[PDB]
């Protein structure tokens, strides 16, 4: 069976073909020592990936070696597909075709080293790389509709229809997760919850996930923050230290749907993905606006599924029916395409196989692969 | 009064300014605001003829692009009482501001503008001209009591929590 | 004296009937300050035209109010031309008559609206709203030829025999050197290059103007660019980040041979030419093919003339002597052609004067101009 | 006329808008008496302010109501400002306008406090809070230029182009003096000397201002100074001993560049407003590579401005030209802003005034100052 | 040999470990600083791919991240008069070393190696590879005897204090 890996730029999701769930789910990681160890026997191991750095953050500096979806370090993600491939599924990568995500408009050397690793440092005996979005309506199971994915590094929109991508219309939008956990602890500082520093991202990420929300009217949000403090929660930290956190909880993914409040001009999701179906041809309008696909874990947001129906109808005409749809499994929806595609009998001459990469290098996968 | 009237939706988008920008220490809401509606108004080009003449001469008087000519309307607004024909014209535009199709996104526009830039920080004394703008946006007139706002002092739930960087220099 | 405005999608060229090239070239922008404050004394101009906006880029959102050849911000379009006659050309209009340009197949409200701002906002003594094609042809000193006229906005070719104009042999192509602009940042991003903002967006303008150049056959210059790295060219962005590009060079212009890059269905401009050519009578077609006159800033890529040359003479009959004409003052050729026009003593009745537009009001302008 | 800026951390900075100067420093410290109390005339008062706490530290547990930038005893605080109205500056604070610093991203409570006792306990008529980094641009005659303030508890970067900042690049880090003093005292010990709290602290303090330098080449100092004694120095302690201090004197602001000397993850001085341009406008940098205005007590030190310099230089494109700014009054730019801040009559509507206040309550600094 | 190959800048900076790791019990400087090198030595995308391949392959060879791979080219290299080929291209190596745009923060990074982790303890007897990589950023090979050391015991200035550093004692 093939091996699917969605290596995210936060979390790497891989498993085995033809599951409905990844085997293992981990953060996208690689930690090294800050301080002096300073016993005998203790720290002869120079970096942490995943789960064991996330224990482990308060002595580690955490990296990502994947930033808005790119790869920025190469020898930090051999590690990760290390400790996918042997610690995780405990696999001989030599015996699994892989298959392998990435976001669409992504550099191309993103790509090519990837195939690269994958069949010179692993010896997989093929791959692939595809596109999230695809994978994601894949996973839906619908054959038509426009894929909003946003994940930590990347929010992109792909419109599909009958199968067929529209590539000119193609949205990507570098704002997404860890855009939203640089603005929460900018915006923690105004009460006292001074993080500013590099230590509690990981943490102060965790308060994201736990509280933010989507305010389907801000204003009335902003109003109800500032009136009853029955928005206000709190949120307990490692130390056992509480923070409480009032209007935050709806301006951090506010900046989603108003890329300002971080100085970027870009409109906010919900006007790209208008602006994706605007792209399209007139014909197809009707059916994309029908079958938004949400995918991502910045999809999770509580109340963002209700807003972006809320704004593309009104950016939409009147008669068009906007309909978003969020599976409770959208977290995951990428990797389950991945899963579904690889498994099926047709794919299985898509693959890039070892003797077409060696007969015509790491380039082979832009002619296999969309 | 105008009947056939028709307006491009979302050709008032690309003219709200950055949330930031509101807050600039010398931004114009007042001017900013009225140049959005003044946008909006913009009758859609399938109206016919003589409706977008008629109506034009409306909006151009009562939002006029020159600033000269907004401080002018601005002044013989302040003294209302003696100008039943800009009540009147006010009356007109107000409704149909009112039965604008792209109203609610609007009203948010200028709830953003009241929140951000400090659009209604006069609430009562708000001029007549953009008061009937806002009045036509928000029909109850709730926006004359100025935007709720955080207070953060004194607050229940704040109390001095101390980060990794802030136990370096502690002090007690 | 007359004024003379070719008010482009992308450029106003503005200056005197009778001068040799206009007077005033400047970005066709307008720029309105996006970040915050903070000084006192340094915020209170909102809003900045032309190549003041373009040197402030940095803190701006810059918009142009015509698109495709269309005006769609009337009140930014207004300021424009206030700026070209009271900053620029340093006029008082209502002393001036002005001609000014449009695009053929326009929307008729673009001429009415323009008429009514003339004379009703700048009280002009009279106008005339002349086609950019026959302006460029008048700059040719021909009278009988197919202009192709390509700028910022649309791509348009009027064929003209004996000085008859063909109006069912005008075609018109939405694609234009923005839509190139907009791809080159697309496919730049292929290289890790990513260029979102506007102010990035007149960046990557500037690269394609000088980096830029049609092949003269796309499939060898592919394969030259894939073996080698002999068409690589390096620019210094403005914060001295140095990139570099390949086949990204010719690949954008390309586009306009080959609109299916940018998921256009159109035919390219050579094709576009033929067609115009072919929808005239069979016994003008021969003059039209020895008589293709280029104008506008997208027609002054390198080696565009020739890749014409040779697409024209793939598809006519191999009889036919085709020649371009592509002067090296092609981007001013819509002016220089309205600037002799409006100087011709055989052109002053031909004005719209302002007791005309009071009798009749905006609609004469359909009447007494083409 | 008006009195104008200071929350500094470790000095109070207090005068007259439109004079060049503060009129009164005097240190932010308020100290109680411990171990004394017999003789009946060996002082009444249980606090000292300012100067004369100073002199008495040898029986005073003295301690700063200001720690990073952050006010944190308000009964000390209110102390100091009484002080600085009643006693320093000679004046009735109900009478006078009254302008106050902050560093930005500071809690928001506290600049409501600020601006409640202000009006509720001093009366002032109208009162305002700037942005220290502002205040040192408007010092530096600039309107451009990214400005890095360190005082006694904060380092922050506001880069502002043409009185316009960017918000979302504002750097701060909580390492400025109050660590270097702290490390120092820490680095004296290895060499013999202890210096315990408080009033130890501040003879430390004394030595640092007087003997610390940064090192161009570090690496090369620090070899220097280990095969020779050139690099020695010597200091006379309060009771007549003498300290020799080696390379301890530039390894204490070796700090700035290297945070992880004290245990800190952060990057250095130099790196953060490295960082905090490469966040600005690419069409900015240039300008912000230039126009590097220094600030603030810590950004004396003796080469500080040439290893940022180097510093900068580096991590930088080499067309870049890298200039620091390092005005002579840098301790006292942030007033000398403020004095011309508050003499500016364009200014005069930015104040605060009673009327405002009770009308809205504290929350008003929000919605009226940066 | 690499023509045209090019850098990221300042690609390497995040490899550095933090001072305090430097001086761990069981710090592996010469592995970690090899990495720092490896990230700086990583081509820039800019960089034509043939040359990318061919360069990328060279550090493969002498700069690999694998573990087993480094100790076995350790142990290879010292016999490097019995492999003519390895020792010529660590000259190809260390020549693209010192034409590196940033070989001064690189030697920079190299001397903090040096001083606080001890990558240079073991002087003129180090590895040949480590030696020729530091070779390529110290030209004249002094920190084969560089790291001077500061020492404190019979150092002048040595004294007792008290009274304004506590601990007093006037009882002697
Ligand atoms: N329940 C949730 N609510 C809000 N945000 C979430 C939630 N779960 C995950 N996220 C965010 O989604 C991001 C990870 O999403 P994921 O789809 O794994 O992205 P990637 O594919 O890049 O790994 C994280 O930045 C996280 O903060
Ligand atoms: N030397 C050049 N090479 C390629 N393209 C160019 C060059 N100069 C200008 N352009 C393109 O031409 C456009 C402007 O042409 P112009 O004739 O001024 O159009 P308009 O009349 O709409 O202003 C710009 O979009 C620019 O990208
Ligand atoms: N010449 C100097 N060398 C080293 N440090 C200095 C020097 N002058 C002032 N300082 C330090 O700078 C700090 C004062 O800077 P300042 O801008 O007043 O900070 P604040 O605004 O917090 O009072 C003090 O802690 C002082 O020790
Ligand atoms: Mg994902
Ligand atoms: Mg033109
Ligand atoms: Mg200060």
Redesign the pocket.
């Known amino acids: 069976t093939a091996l699917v890996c969605?290596n995210?730029?936060?979390?790497v999701?891989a498993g085995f073909a033809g599951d409905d769930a990844p085997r293992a789910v981990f953060p996208?990681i690689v930690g090294r020592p800050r301080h002096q160890g300073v016993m005998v026997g203790m720290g002869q191991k120079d970096s942490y990936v995943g789960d064991e750095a996330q224990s482990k953050r308060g002595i580690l500096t955490l990296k990502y070696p994947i930033e808005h979806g790119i790869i920025t370090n190469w020898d930090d993600m051999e590690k990760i597909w290390h400790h996918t491939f042997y610690n995780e599924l405990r696999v001989a990568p030599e015996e699994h075709p892989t298959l392998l995500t990435e976001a669409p408009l992504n550099p191309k050397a993103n790509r090519e080293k990837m195939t690269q690793i994958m069949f010179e440092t692993f010896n997989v005996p093929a791959m692939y790389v595809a596109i999230q979005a695809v994978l994601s309506l894949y996973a839906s199971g619908r054959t038509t509709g426009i894929v909003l994915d946003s994940?930590?590094?990347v929010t992109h929109n792909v419109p599909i229809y009958e199968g067929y991508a529209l590539p000119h219309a193609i949205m990507r939008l570098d704002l997404?997760?860890?855009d939203?956990?640089d603005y929460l602890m900018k915006i923690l500082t105004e009460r006292g919850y001074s993080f500013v520093t590099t230590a509690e991202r990981e943490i102060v990420?965790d308060i994201?996930?736990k509280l933010?929300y989507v305010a389907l009217d801000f204003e009335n949000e902003m109003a109800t923050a500032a009136s009853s403090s029955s928005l206000e929660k709190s949120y307990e930290l490692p130390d056992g230290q509480v923070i409480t956190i009032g209007n935050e909880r709806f301006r951090c993914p506010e900046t989603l749907f108003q890329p300002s409040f971080i100085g970027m001009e870009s409109a906010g999701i919900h006007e790209t993905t208008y602006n994706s179906i605007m792209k399209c041809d007139i014909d197809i309008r009707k059916d994309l606006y029908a079958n938004n696909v949400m995918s991502?874990?910045?999809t999770?947001?509580p109340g963002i599924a209700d807003r972006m129906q809320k704004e593309i109808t009104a950016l939409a005409p009147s008669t068009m029916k906007i309909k978003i749809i969020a599976p409770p499994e959208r977290?995951y929806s990428?990797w389950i395409g991945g899963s579904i595609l690889a498994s099926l009998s047709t794919f299985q001459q898509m693959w890039i196989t070892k003797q077409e990469y060696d007969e015509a290098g790491p380039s082979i996968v832009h002619r296999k692969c969309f | 009064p105008f009947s056939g009237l028709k307006f491009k939706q979302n050709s008032f988008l690309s003219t709200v300014p950055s949330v930031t920008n509101m807050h600039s220490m010398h931004f114009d809401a007042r001017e900013t605001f009225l140049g959005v509606i003044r946008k909006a108004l913009e009758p859609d080009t399938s109206t016919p003829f003589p409706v977008r003449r008629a109506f034009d001469g409306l909006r151009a008087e009562i939002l006029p692009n020159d600033t000269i000519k907004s401080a002018a309307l601005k002044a013989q607004c302040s003294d209302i009482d003696k100008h039943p024909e800009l009540k009147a014209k006010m009356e007109t535009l107000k409704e149909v501001i009112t039965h604008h199709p792209q109203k609610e996104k609007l009203a948010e526009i200028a709830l953003q503008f009241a929140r951000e830039a400090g659009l209604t920080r006069l609430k009562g004394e708000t001029d007549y001209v953009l008061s009937n703008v806002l009045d036509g946006l928000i029909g109850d007139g709730s926006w004359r009591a100025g935007p709720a706002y955080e207070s953060y002092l004194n607050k229940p739930g704040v109390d001095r929590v101390i980060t990794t960087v802030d136990g370096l220099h502690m002090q007690r």
């Open positions: 969605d995210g730029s936060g979390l999701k996208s994940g930590d590094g997404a997760g860890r939203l956990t990420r994201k996930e933010c991502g874990g910045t999770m947001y977290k990428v």
